[PDB]
CSV table of C-alpha atoms in Angstrom, one decimal:
chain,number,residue,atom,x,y,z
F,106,UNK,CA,0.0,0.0,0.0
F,107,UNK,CA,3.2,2.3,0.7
F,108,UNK,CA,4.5,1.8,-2.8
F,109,UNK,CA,1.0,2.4,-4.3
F,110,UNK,CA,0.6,5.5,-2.7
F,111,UNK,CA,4.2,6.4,-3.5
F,112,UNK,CA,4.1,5.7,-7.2
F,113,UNK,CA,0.2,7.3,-7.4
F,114,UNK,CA,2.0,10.4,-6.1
F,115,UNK,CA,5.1,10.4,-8.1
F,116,UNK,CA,2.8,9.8,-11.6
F,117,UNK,CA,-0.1,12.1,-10.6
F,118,UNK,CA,2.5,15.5,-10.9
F,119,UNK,CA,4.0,14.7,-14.2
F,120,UNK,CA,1.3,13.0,-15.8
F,121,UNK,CA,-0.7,16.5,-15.0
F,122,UNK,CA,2.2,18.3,-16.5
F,123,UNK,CA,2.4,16.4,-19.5
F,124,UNK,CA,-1.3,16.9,-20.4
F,125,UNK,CA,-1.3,20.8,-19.3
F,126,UNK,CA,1.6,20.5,-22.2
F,127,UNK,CA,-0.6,18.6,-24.6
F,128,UNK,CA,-3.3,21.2,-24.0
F,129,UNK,CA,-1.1,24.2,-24.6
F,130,UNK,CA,-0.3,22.7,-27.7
F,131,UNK,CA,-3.5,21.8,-28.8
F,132,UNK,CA,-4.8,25.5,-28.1
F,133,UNK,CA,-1.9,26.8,-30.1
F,134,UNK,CA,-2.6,24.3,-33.2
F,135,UNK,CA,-6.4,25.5,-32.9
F,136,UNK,CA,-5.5,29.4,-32.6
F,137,UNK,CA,-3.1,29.1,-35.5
F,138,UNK,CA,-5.6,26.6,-37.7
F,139,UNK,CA,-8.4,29.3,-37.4
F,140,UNK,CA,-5.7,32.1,-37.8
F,141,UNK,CA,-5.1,30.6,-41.3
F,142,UNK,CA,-8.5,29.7,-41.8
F,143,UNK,CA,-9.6,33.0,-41.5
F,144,UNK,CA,-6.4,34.7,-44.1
F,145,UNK,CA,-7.9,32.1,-46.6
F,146,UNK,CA,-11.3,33.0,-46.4
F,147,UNK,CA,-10.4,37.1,-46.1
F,148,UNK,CA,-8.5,35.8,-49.5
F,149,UNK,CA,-11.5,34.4,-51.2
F,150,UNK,CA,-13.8,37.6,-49.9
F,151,UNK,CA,-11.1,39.8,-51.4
F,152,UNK,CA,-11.2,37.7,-54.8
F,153,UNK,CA,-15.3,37.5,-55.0
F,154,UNK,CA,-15.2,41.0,-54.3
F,155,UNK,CA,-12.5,42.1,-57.0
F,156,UNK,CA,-14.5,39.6,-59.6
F,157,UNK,CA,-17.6,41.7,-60.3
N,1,UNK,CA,-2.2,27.9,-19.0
N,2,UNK,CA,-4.3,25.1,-16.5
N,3,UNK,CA,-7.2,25.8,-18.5
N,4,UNK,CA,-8.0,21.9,-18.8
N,5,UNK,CA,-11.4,23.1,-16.6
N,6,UNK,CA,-12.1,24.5,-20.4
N,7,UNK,CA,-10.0,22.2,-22.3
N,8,UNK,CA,-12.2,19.3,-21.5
N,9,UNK,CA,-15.4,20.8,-21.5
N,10,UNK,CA,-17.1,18.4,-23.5
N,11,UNK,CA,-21.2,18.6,-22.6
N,12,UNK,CA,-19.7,19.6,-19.1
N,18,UNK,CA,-19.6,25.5,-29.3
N,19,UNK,CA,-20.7,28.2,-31.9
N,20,UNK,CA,-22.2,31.4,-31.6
N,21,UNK,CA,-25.7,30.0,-30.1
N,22,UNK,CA,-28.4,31.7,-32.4
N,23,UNK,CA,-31.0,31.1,-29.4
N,24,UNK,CA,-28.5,33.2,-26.9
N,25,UNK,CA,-28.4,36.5,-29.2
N,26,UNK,CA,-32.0,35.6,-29.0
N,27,UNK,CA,-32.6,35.8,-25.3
N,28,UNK,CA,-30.4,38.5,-25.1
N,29,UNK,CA,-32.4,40.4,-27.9
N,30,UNK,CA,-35.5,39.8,-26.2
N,31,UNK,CA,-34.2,40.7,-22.9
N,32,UNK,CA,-33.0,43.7,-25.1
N,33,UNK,CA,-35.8,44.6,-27.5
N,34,UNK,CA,-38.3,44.2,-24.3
N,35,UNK,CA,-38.6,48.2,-23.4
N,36,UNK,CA,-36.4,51.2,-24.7
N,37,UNK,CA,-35.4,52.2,-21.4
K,64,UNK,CA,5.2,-9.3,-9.3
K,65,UNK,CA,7.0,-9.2,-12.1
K,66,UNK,CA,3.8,-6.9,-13.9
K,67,UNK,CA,4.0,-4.8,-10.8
K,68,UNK,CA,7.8,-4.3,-11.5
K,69,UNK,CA,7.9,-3.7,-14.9
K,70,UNK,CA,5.6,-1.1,-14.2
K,71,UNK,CA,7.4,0.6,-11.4
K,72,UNK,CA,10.7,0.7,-13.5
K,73,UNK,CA,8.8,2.2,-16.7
K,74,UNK,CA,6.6,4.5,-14.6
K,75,UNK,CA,7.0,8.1,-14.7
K,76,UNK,CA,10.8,8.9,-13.7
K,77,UNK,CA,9.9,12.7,-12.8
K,78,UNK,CA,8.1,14.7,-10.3
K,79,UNK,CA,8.8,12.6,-7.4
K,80,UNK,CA,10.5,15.1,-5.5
K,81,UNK,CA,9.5,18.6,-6.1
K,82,UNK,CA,12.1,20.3,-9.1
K,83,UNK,CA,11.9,18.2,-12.3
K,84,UNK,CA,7.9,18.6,-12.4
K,85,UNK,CA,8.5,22.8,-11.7
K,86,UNK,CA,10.8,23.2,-13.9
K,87,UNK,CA,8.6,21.2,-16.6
K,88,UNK,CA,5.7,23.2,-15.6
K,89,UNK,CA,7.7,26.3,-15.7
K,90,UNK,CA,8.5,25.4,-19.5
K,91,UNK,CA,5.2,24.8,-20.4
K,92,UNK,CA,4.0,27.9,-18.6
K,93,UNK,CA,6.4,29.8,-20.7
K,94,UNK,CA,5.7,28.0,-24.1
K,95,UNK,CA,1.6,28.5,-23.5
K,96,UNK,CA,2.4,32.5,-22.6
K,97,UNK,CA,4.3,32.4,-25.9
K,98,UNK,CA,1.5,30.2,-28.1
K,99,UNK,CA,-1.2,32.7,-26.0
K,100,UNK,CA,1.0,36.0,-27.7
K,101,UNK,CA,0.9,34.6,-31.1
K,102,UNK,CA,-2.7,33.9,-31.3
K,103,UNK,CA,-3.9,36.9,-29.7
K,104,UNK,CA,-2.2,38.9,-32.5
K,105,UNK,CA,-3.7,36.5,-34.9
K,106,UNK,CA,-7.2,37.2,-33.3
K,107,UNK,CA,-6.4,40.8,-33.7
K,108,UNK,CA,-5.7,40.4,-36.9
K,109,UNK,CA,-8.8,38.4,-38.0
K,110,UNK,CA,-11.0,40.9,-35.6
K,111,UNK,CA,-9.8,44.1,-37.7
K,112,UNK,CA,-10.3,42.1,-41.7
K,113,UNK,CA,-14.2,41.4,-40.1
K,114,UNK,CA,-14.2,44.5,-38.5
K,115,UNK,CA,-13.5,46.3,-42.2
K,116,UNK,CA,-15.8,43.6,-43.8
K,117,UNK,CA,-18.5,44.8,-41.7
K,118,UNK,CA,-18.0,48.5,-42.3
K,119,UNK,CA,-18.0,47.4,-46.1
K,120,UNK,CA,-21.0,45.7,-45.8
K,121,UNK,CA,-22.7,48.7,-44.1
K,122,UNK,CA,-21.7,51.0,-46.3
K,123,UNK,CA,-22.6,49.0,-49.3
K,124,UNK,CA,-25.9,48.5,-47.3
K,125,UNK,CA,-26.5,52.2,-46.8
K,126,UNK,CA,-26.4,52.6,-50.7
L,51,UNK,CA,-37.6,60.0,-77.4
L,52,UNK,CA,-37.9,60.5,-73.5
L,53,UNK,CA,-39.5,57.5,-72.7
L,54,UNK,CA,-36.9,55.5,-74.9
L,55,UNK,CA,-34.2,57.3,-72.9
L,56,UNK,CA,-35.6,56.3,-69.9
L,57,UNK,CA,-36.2,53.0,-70.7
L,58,UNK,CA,-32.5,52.2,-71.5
L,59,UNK,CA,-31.1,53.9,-68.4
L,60,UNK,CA,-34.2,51.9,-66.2
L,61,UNK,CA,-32.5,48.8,-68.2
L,62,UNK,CA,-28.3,49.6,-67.4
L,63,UNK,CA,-29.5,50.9,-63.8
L,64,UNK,CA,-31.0,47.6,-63.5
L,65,UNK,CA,-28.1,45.8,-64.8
L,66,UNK,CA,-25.8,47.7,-62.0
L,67,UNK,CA,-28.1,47.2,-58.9
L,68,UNK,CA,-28.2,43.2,-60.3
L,69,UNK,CA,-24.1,43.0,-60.6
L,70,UNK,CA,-24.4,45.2,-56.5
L,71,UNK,CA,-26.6,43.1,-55.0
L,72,UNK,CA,-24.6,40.1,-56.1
L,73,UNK,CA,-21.9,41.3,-55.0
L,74,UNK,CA,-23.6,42.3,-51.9
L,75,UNK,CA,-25.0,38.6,-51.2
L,76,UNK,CA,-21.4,37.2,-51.7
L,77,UNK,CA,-19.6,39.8,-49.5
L,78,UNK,CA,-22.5,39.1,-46.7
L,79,UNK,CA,-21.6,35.2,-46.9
L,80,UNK,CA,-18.5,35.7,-46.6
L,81,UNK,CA,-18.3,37.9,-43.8
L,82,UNK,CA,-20.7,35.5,-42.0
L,83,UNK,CA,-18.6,32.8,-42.5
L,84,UNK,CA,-15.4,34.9,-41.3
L,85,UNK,CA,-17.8,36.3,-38.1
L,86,UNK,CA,-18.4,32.9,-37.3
L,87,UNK,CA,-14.5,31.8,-38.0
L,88,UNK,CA,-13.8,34.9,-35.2
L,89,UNK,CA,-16.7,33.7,-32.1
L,90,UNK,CA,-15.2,30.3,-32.7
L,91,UNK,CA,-11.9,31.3,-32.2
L,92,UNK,CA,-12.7,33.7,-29.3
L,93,UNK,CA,-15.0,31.7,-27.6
L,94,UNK,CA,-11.6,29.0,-27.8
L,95,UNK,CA,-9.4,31.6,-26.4
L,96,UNK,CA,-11.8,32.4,-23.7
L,97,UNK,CA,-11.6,28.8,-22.7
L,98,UNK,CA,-7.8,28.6,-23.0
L,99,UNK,CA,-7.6,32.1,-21.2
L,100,UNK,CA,-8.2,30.3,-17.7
């Protein structure tokens, strides 16, 4: 029971930094997906517009 | 950062169309 | 016993103590304050070309 | 000869407000698509935000 409790508290810290990481980095890909998203569709605006 | 609270907020997400609509009705209710 | 081995010898070799996990969360702090700068200027950015696509639209509108 | 004149500028002032308002409907669709692009994105950073 020791070593269960010592290993639950030596994998609960790093696992929680390791997803706070994967969750940061998600966020980023998101922000910079919609960033891009956005430029292509202000490009495709811009191109309907200059059409007519 | 620590915003797995958020992160995981999966049923516990657009622009709701019935919010603006509670909020125009609350709105829209009396020019005060 | 040998499963429960295995598993403590392949477990995670960190944040048993208290300055590997800081300084991994001080990393990641500093990497999502960096990722937070980038696409807050990218919001920005995409705020002002639907904030001028708007005004376009209104003033096209008001014709 | 007035009523002829009319006519045709009735007819190219037709033609224009036809070409605007397409242009119009386009410009709307894609600002709504580029309005909805921007909540989704801030309603993500408000999450992240923490």
């Amino acid at each position: 029971f020791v070593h269960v409790h010592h290993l639950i508290n030596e994998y609960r810290p790093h696992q929680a930094r390791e997803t706070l990481r994967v969750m940061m980095e998600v966020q980023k890909r998101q922000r910079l997906e919609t960033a891009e998203r956005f430029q292509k569709h202000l490009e495709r605006v811009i191109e309907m517009i200059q059409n007519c | 950062c620590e915003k797995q609270v958020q992160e995981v907020g999966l049923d516990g997400q657009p622009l709701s169309m019935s919010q603006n609509l509670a909020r125009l009705a609350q709105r829209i209710d009396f020019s005060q | 016993a040998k499963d429960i081995d295995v598993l403590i010898d392949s477990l995670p070799s960190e944040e048993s103590t208290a300055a590997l996990q800081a300084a991994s969360l001080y990393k990641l702090e500093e990497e999502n304050h960096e990722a937070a700068t980038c696409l807050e200027d990218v919001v920005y950015r995409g705020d002002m070309l639907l904030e001028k696509i708007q005004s376009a639209l209104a003033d096209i509108a008001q014709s | 000869m007035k009523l002829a004149l009319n006519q045709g500028k009735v007819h190219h002032e037709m033609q224009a407000l036809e070409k605007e308002v397409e242009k119009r409907d386009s410009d709307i669709q894609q600002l709504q698509k580029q309005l909805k692009e921007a909540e989704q994105i801030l309603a993500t950073a408000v999450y992240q935000a923490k």
